[PDB]
Amino acid sequence: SLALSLTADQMVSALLDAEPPILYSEYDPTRPFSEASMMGLLTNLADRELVHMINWAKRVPGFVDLTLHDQVHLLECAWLEILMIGLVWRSMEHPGKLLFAPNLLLDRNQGKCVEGMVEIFDMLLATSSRFRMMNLQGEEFVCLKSIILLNSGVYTFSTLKSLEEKDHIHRVLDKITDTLIHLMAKAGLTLQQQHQRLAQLLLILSHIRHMSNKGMEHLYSMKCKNVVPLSDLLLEMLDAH
Amino acid sequence: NSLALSLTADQMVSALLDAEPPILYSEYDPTRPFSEASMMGLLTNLADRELVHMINWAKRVPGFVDLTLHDQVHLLECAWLEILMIGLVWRSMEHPGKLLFAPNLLLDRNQGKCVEGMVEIFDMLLATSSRFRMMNLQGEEFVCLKSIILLNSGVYTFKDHIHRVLDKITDTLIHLMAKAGLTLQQQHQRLAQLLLILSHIRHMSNKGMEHLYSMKCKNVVPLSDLLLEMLDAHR
Amino acid sequence: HKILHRLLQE
Amino acid sequence: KILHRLLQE
Ligand SMILES: OC1(O)[C@]2(Cl)[C@@]3(Cl)[C@]4(Cl)C(Cl)(Cl)[C@@]5(Cl)[C@](Cl)([C@]1(Cl)[C@]53Cl)[C@]24Cl
Ligand SMILES: OC1(O)[C@]2(Cl)[C@@]3(Cl)[C@]4(Cl)C(Cl)(Cl)[C@@]5(Cl)[C@](Cl)([C@]1(Cl)[C@]53Cl)[C@]24Cl
């Protein structure tokens, strides 16, 4: 397996090179946005980002080693967490605002357009605030994102075959932990500081899991209110939960 | 200034071990619960009694009573179900394939089917127990994890004090792994593995909250006002 | 008003 | 399954 022999610097390099692009919305400042149309814009964007996410996942060391059934399950479990942490990362330099796209920068008050969106906006803003508080580094962020992909579905997977699968993901996960520590040591942190920061970073993943489940419930709400149009891929991703 | 930051790692562990709540028993219905109401009756009754002990456990977690009352309320409202579930998983560890709700109430996933929407949470709990089992989770690590949940799960819903106590507990976890002879690479690898399970515990709590809400709406069993108020805080 | 408020103070 | 497809190409 290529993934398991990677060095810390090659892991960072591979994760940085696989970063998907930042996409534009169809937002038109002059066009009036209803509650629905603003939600059509955001779900339109998420659907396009999911296509890039799927192809990004293929470039995460070790992901393609899994069965296609395992790949489908990890993404079905992780996709909303991955969209949200990317959103939080993009919005980190814009306090009190969420940068859904370079041309679409929203604040809490505007997030009150869609019933139910205010609470999730606040959590995303709270997470971005934490990222700023900790001065999260881009190299740390790409590590966190691959951890989410590998970790979020690894305990809802049969045979002793499906158990060798789970065992391989753990070795890759341990490699990403080594990579995180390597980064912090290079940045001149003491060992106590490295362990404290490692913990601070992984604890955020619990809050991202929380926001994802709250978000999955909002998207299911939108769905059978049948006002915001939703893509076929989002609907299938929704059904996975 | 908080006494929690001045304790040692060993004082932290001993304070956490001493605060542990008791293991409670279920009502002694000598009948294998095979109905949805009797199932839900026994478990919510147990959960109600455990919640009273959890609140008094939380007051003995160093750094907790130094927060304002509103912050203590907020943290417990956010974390109560995660804390009950990690306790369930811990108690169930040495019983593969089974969930030890109480020493006189040990169930398997076949009995999770007696309740609509329960076998799914049942399987998540069982997988977590097996994960703890294979990692050889120790009781000193378990009590650190449980206090991390209490202080962490609501901290981003607002901080300085809680994050320092959180760092203090990380130091305590590392201290416990070093004492156990683990190498530095093993120390941070095991720390990561432990904290990543907290993501899965968060997920199970969210699903469990949804199930408990549907059973409230099903009116299958009367729920206590305490349990109802803990549920309502998650909106 | 919440029972939790009261149990935390007891 | 759309995701199944997208992973395969
Ligand atoms: O960022 C998202 O992916 C996330 Cl997480 C939110 Cl925050 C929710 Cl919860 C709603 Cl339904 Cl409000 C919507 Cl439109 C979706 Cl599809 C996007 Cl684009 C937002 Cl903005 C979803 Cl699932
Ligand atoms: O362990 C619990 O606390 C948890 Cl987390 C589960 Cl698993 C759910 Cl989700 C259901 Cl509704 Cl199945 C029930 Cl009865 C509750 Cl009250 C207990 Cl006792 C179980 Cl067994 C709740 Cl909230």
Author numbering:
A (entry chain A): 305 to 461, 464 to 547
B (entry chain B): 304 to 461, 472 to 548
C (entry chain D): 687 to 696
D (entry chain C): 688 to 696
From the paper:
ERs and their endogenous ligand, 17β-estradiol (E2), play important roles in the growth and maintenance of a diverse range of tissues. The LBD is crucially involved in most of the receptor functions because of its capacity for hormone binding, dimerization, and interaction with coregulators. To allow the crystallization of ERα bound to the environmental molecules acting essentially as partial agonists that are unable to induce a stable conformation of the LBD, we used the ERα-Y537S LBD mutant described previously by Nettles et al. (2008). The structures display the canonical active conformation, with helix H12 capping the ligand-binding pocket (LBP) and the SRC-1 peptide bound to the “AF-2 surface” formed by helices H3, H5, and H12.
Interestingly, some of these compounds displayed different activation capabilities of the two receptor subtypes, as illustrated by TCBPA and chlordecone, which were significantly more efficacious for ERα (50% and 39%, respectively) than for ERβ (17% and 19%, respectively). Finally, two compounds, BBP and chlordecone, were not engaged in any direct interaction with either of these polar residues, the latter being indirectly hydrogen bonded to E353 via water molecules. As a consequence, they are less efficient in stabilizing the LBP side chain conformations required to hold the active form of the receptor. Among the 12 compounds tested, only 2 displayed a fully AF-1–independent activity. These 2 compounds are BP-2, which acted as a full agonist of the entire or truncated ER forms, and more surprisingly, chlordecone, whose partial agonist activity on ERα also relied exclusively on the AF-2. In contrast, ferutinine, TCBPA, and chlordecone acted as ERβ antagonists in both the FL and ΔAB constructs. In a similar manner, Li et al. (2013) observed that chlordecone activated ERα in HeLa cells, but it was unable to do so in HepG2 cells.
